[PDB]
Design a protein around this ligand. Structure first.
Ligand SMILES: CCCc1nc2[nH]c(N)nc(=S)c2[nH]1
Ligand code: NI
Length: 316
């Protein structure tokens, strides 16, 4: 019945946030391996869920245009002030990406070349739960299959928000829902394979061993290294996944996830080899060393710089 809006359709219901294309390219951010809940349902229009509400986002060269669907038999309105701040903070727009790109460019000619083509890659500030379980699904996987798993997981376990065209949107489930006695069985039947065990076991572990979601919020204010190490006690969470969560949801901008992509980037593009290490290929020790190399080179926002290259290594 209700349809995904476009700017043309319902301009009475869009609000705008002053935002240069150069600070944020929706198309390079929203589906390049940070969040898995956004889809271009119609051209230049991105729809997804943000905190138990649905949004559609589109942009000009200097304007970020957005609309909200409340769902709960509400009377349609433009987004409010508080909702706009929520979106502001989700894109961490207080942070200048232009100044970061210069700062990183000043020490890295390779970064300079690549960043010509790939402007407006910034980091979303995600909900810890959602980001955690999304990244547990990320092992031995690609964006598209992850996307499918997260979507089914939310339809099967999370509350219904609204339907738009033939797309039904669910909120991310709470830990208790993912932790009950049938959850692993269900999740396998939803295609998650072995990841299903890690999801259920991690939900159960945070609840019982860590005191529920308030633990993830403490990690958000704990130092990077503490957060990292604590995340790595969870089932299915290792260094890479922990780094992603650190970077993407726990306000650790120095977190540098080292996966097959950045290991390859480092060798190919920077000529880096593990130096102290005698082993030549990947290892937990060499992966940690490579993270330190990037922090050393880029500074306390290495994780954000990493994302720019990550996003570019995906596009040929
Ligand atoms: C396969 C998509 C999930 C994903 N894996 C990643 N690995 C690294 N190193 N960086 C980022 S930003 C990232 N995102
Ligand atoms: Ni070599």
């Amino acid at each position: 019945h209700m349809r995904h809006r476009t700017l043309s359709s319902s301009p009475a219901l869009w609000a705008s946030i002053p935002c240069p294309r150069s600070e944020l390219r929706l198309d390079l951010v929203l589906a390049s391996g940070q969040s898995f809940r956004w889809k271009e349902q119609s051209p230049a229009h991105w729809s997804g869920v943000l905190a138990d509400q649905v949004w559609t986002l589109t942009q000009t060269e200097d304007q970020l245009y957005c609309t909200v669907y409340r769902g709960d038999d509400s009377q349609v309105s433009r987004p409010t002030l508080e909702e706009l701040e929520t979106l502001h903070k989700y894109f961490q727009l207080d942070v200048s990406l232009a100044q970061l790109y210069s700062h990183w460019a000043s020490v890295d000619s390779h970064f300079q070349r690549v960043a010509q083509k790939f402007q407006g890659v910034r980091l979303l500030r995600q909900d810890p739960t959602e980001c955690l379980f999304s990244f547990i699904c990320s092992s031995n996987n690609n964006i598209a299959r992850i996307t499918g798993m997260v979507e089914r997981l939310c339809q099967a376990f999370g509350p219904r928000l609204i339907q738009l065209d033939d797309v039904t949107y669910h909120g991310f489930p709470n830990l208790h829902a993912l932790a009950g006695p049938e959850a692993e069985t269900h999740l396998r039947k939803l295609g998650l394979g072995y990841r299903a065990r890690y999801v259920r076991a991690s939900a159960k572990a945070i609840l019982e061993e860590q005191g529920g979601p308030a633990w993830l919020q403490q990690l958000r204010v704990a130092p990077y290294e503490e957060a990292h190490k604590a995340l790595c006690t969870l089932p299915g969470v290792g260094a890479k996944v922990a780094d992603c969560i650190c970077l993407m949801a726990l306000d650790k901008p120095q977190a540098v996830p080292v996966d097959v992509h950045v290991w390859q980037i480092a060798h190919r593009d920077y000529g880096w080899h593990p130096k102290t290490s005698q082993a030549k290929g990947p290892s937990p020790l060499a992966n940690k060393e490579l993270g330190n190399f990037f922090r050393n080179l880029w500074g306390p926002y290495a994780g954000w710089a990493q994302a720019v290259l990550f996003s570019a290594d995906l596009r040929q």
